[PDB]
Design a protein around this motif. Sequence first.
Motif, PDB file in Angstrom:
ATOM      1  N   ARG A   1       1.161  19.783 -29.791  1.00 16.21           N
ATOM      2  CA  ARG A   1      -0.110  20.179 -30.383  1.00 16.21           C
ATOM      3  C   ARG A   1      -0.039  21.592 -30.937  1.00 16.21           C
ATOM      4  O   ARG A   1      -0.472  21.853 -32.072  1.00 16.21           O
ATOM      5  CB  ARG A   1      -1.207  20.070 -29.332  1.00 16.21           C
ATOM      6  CG  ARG A   1      -2.559  20.543 -29.774  1.00 16.21           C
ATOM      7  CD  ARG A   1      -3.471  20.723 -28.586  1.00 16.21           C
ATOM      8  NE  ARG A   1      -3.094  21.868 -27.772  1.00 16.21           N
ATOM      9  CZ  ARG A   1      -3.562  23.092 -27.961  1.00 16.21           C
ATOM     10  NH1 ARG A   1      -4.417  23.322 -28.939  1.00 16.21           N
ATOM     11  NH2 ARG A   1      -3.171  24.085 -27.183  1.00 16.21           N
ATOM     12  N   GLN A   2       0.513  22.516 -30.147  1.00 16.39           N
ATOM     13  CA  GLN A   2       0.689  23.889 -30.602  1.00 16.39           C
ATOM     14  C   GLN A   2       1.625  23.973 -31.793  1.00 16.39           C
ATOM     15  O   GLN A   2       1.349  24.698 -32.756  1.00 16.39           O
ATOM     16  CB  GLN A   2       1.230  24.738 -29.468  1.00 16.39           C
ATOM     17  CG  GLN A   2       0.276  24.926 -28.332  1.00 16.39           C
ATOM     18  CD  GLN A   2       0.880  25.740 -27.242  1.00 16.39           C
ATOM     19  OE1 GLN A   2       0.516  25.608 -26.088  1.00 16.39           O
ATOM     20  NE2 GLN A   2       1.823  26.587 -27.597  1.00 16.39           N
TER      21      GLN A   2
ATOM     22  N   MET B   1       0.824  -1.202   0.000  1.00 19.54           N
ATOM     23  CA  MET B   1       0.000   0.000   0.000  1.00 19.54           C
ATOM     24  C   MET B   1       0.860   1.255   0.000  1.00 19.54           C
ATOM     25  O   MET B   1       0.495   2.262  -0.609  1.00 19.54           O
ATOM     26  CB  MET B   1      -0.935  -0.018   1.204  1.00 19.54           C
ATOM     27  CG  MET B   1      -1.993   1.054   1.195  1.00 19.54           C
ATOM     28  SD  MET B   1      -2.386   1.613   2.856  1.00 19.54           S
ATOM     29  CE  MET B   1      -0.753   1.973   3.477  1.00 19.54           C
TER      30      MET B   1
ATOM     31  N   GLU C   1       1.581   3.663  -3.484  1.00 16.99           N
ATOM     32  CA  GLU C   1       1.325   5.076  -3.255  1.00 16.99           C
ATOM     33  C   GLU C   1       2.347   5.925  -3.986  1.00 16.99           C
ATOM     34  O   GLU C   1       2.000   6.954  -4.569  1.00 16.99           O
ATOM     35  CB  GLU C   1       1.352   5.370  -1.760  1.00 16.99           C
ATOM     36  CG  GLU C   1       0.930   6.759  -1.366  1.00 16.99           C
ATOM     37  CD  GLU C   1       0.862   6.927   0.140  1.00 16.99           C
ATOM     38  OE1 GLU C   1       1.018   5.919   0.856  1.00 16.99           O
ATOM     39  OE2 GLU C   1       0.658   8.066   0.610  1.00 16.99           O
TER      40      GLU C   1
ATOM     41  N   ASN D   1       1.131  19.146 -25.133  1.00 18.27           N
ATOM     42  CA  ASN D   1       0.582  20.464 -25.439  1.00 18.27           C
ATOM     43  C   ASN D   1       1.530  21.263 -26.315  1.00 18.27           C
ATOM     44  O   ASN D   1       1.091  21.966 -27.232  1.00 18.27           O
ATOM     45  CB  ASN D   1       0.284  21.229 -24.159  1.00 18.27           C
ATOM     46  CG  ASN D   1      -0.919  20.696 -23.432  1.00 18.27           C
ATOM     47  OD1 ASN D   1      -0.908  20.566 -22.217  1.00 18.27           O
ATOM     48  ND2 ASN D   1      -1.966  20.393 -24.168  1.00 18.27           N
TER      49      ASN D   1
ATOM     50  N   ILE E   1      -0.174  22.727 -35.012  1.00 18.40           N
ATOM     51  CA  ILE E   1      -1.089  23.702 -35.598  1.00 18.40           C
ATOM     52  C   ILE E   1      -0.318  24.833 -36.267  1.00 18.40           C
ATOM     53  O   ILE E   1      -0.657  25.247 -37.384  1.00 18.40           O
ATOM     54  CB  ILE E   1      -2.062  24.226 -34.534  1.00 18.40           C
ATOM     55  CG1 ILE E   1      -2.867  23.072 -33.960  1.00 18.40           C
ATOM     56  CG2 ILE E   1      -3.017  25.181 -35.133  1.00 18.40           C
ATOM     57  CD1 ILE E   1      -3.764  23.451 -32.843  1.00 18.40           C
ATOM     58  N   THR E   2       0.773  25.293 -35.644  1.00 17.32           N
ATOM     59  CA  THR E   2       1.587  26.344 -36.249  1.00 17.32           C
ATOM     60  C   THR E   2       2.264  25.886 -37.534  1.00 17.32           C
ATOM     61  O   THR E   2       2.266  26.620 -38.521  1.00 17.32           O
ATOM     62  CB  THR E   2       2.634  26.833 -35.260  1.00 17.32           C
ATOM     63  OG1 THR E   2       2.013  27.148 -34.021  1.00 17.32           O
ATOM     64  CG2 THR E   2       3.295  28.059 -35.779  1.00 17.32           C
TER      65      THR E   2
END
Lengths: 141, 538, 50
Positions: C31-32, C6, C10, C28, C35-36
């Motif tokens: 992804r940016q 346990m 953890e 992210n 698109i650019t």
Amino acid sequence: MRYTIMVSATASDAAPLQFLAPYSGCAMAEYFRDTGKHGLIIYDDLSKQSVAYRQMSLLLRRPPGREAFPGDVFYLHSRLLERAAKLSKELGGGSLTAFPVIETQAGDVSAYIATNVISITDGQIFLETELFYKGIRPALN
Amino acid sequence: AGYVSQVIGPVVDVRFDGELPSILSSLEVEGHSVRLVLEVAQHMGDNTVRCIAMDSTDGLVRGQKVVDTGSPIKVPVGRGTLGRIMNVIGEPVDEQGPIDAADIWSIHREAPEFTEQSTEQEILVTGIKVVDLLAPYQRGGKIGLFGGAGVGKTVLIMELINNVAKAHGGFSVFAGVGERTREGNDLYREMIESGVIKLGAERGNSKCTLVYGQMNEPPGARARVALTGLTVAEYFRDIEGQDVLLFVDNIFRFTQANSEVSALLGRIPSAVGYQPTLATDLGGLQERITTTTKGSITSVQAVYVPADDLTDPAPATTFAHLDATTVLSRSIAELGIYPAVDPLDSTSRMLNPNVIGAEHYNVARGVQKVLQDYKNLQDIIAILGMDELSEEDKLTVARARKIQRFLSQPFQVAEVFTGTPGKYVDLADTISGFQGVLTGKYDDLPEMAFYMVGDIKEVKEKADKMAKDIASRKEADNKKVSEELKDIPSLDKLVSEIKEVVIEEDDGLEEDFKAEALSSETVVLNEEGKSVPLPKKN
Amino acid sequence: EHASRMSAMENSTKSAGEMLGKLTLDYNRKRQATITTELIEIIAGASALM
């Protein structure tokens, strides 16, 4: 069919007809909205209407924006979808309910036209393809 | 004096044989269905200006006369705009007559220059406990509201309007930039219902001017409606001398609208997809929201984060301008705590001891540390046991459990449907109240004593009523008479009491219908312009 | 053993959350940048015709 109109601009039809079919069907359903009765408009694959409008605008050499789309591709769908309203009692009290249908690609709501229509509409009904084959049909996430 | 030369979508080229209008000047297209206002975007050369329309351009002919107004878009400002709804160009869309204009101001303006700015950096007391303590509002600052649906955002909007008008005597403008018309009508009727907007003869006692640029308007109309709300707010700042509240509803839609009008004017998009002028098109709006020597404008702007990505350039450019965030949470609202401000994810730049003092700063940091200390053991309580750990750990559990209750507060605009009277809470009372709970002067009072009350001399009266309620329980009993025949009839009696409604198989639909006859022939115009069939030879 | 597991799972969710957060930030960024770069390709295609 005693209550349903069908406005069908198919794949072999020209791109301006696929662009103008949701607007023409909304004009047919605004008859029921405007005269007291109640409407239900279903724009099945507003994705494909968006692709047809992008075709006409790239061929008219309007300046392209994201993914190839024009600047007013948000204004396209918002101008279309804001005609689904519930009118006031001094206008007959009629209403029109839109169900736009947007196809996603591998289930992202971050695509450009999908984000535009998510920004326009009130709710969403997100159907997940993983839930489809788990037996859950309608596959509503 | 000028005539339409090109119409490409929402983008109209007008040609002037005389002298050109200035950039940002307003032009009226003379002769149209509705009022078509264009705003001059650039001078293209060869006596052509390039304009962006504020309404639809469908129905526009090359050669249509266009009148230059000699100025930018000019909107009515003053106390006569309160309780009214305007569109971007200043027309009343609330259908309640004209707008009683004190003045007619240009919406385009430079920011208040360096000598006019305030160096003071003081706090705007809002009367809301969780907002005044943990994430204070700068007087003259911009505040990002990360709410949504069902977290009580509209009640918080109307209470900031109510409490700022009540305390500081300032008025409010709501700029609905690109909002849906169903949501805008809901906010309008909810403001009429809550008394911050009054109709008819009591119209002067309204606290809010709505400036609505709806989602079905063209991108030029959504891109400028925040400036119209700014102009209405700047009149109250610069002439009335008030502490104004401006609400830019979805600053991201302002960004997206200006990105659309930058894409339509043929400019190359910058990073991810945005306008190349994104920082300056945002800063032109946000720098007019400041404290002048006359008054201030405090802006509460709802912020949408595009792909749950804070490094996207539209929220990364907006967050440079923000002075506070108040994150409204669904998990806070599902503990029945209202307002639903997340007390740990809300930030403020005003939270340091050089602007609010060490007293307020240490009370806020103690409250925030105690709630954080409770937050990172809830996977230790739910896993190993509630009374499993120490008494000091359960002391922080009880203290944060009653501080988490104490941040809730009844609202004055919510009393017309909740009954509970709303309670404005002052700042020093909030500090002296939360300090007492933090030291432990109220460890004996119950957790429901700290619930929906104003200040610290109401949790005592709440517990006093709760312990008078012990002696009011032996006044009666609990029972439910007649287990099978009190009011529950036979099911045939229940279907023989419901009344049959009238259903007809003639649906009708020919009630006030024209029924024109549509020609199957195609009807064109000849060179004289008369409706003629097609000449039947290619 | 059960309590040690346990405490061991953890730290595994802690590690699989911090690795997830790093991977989400880098996604992210990708992804940016996607698109650019697709936008710069489209603009360069259109500008070579007009």
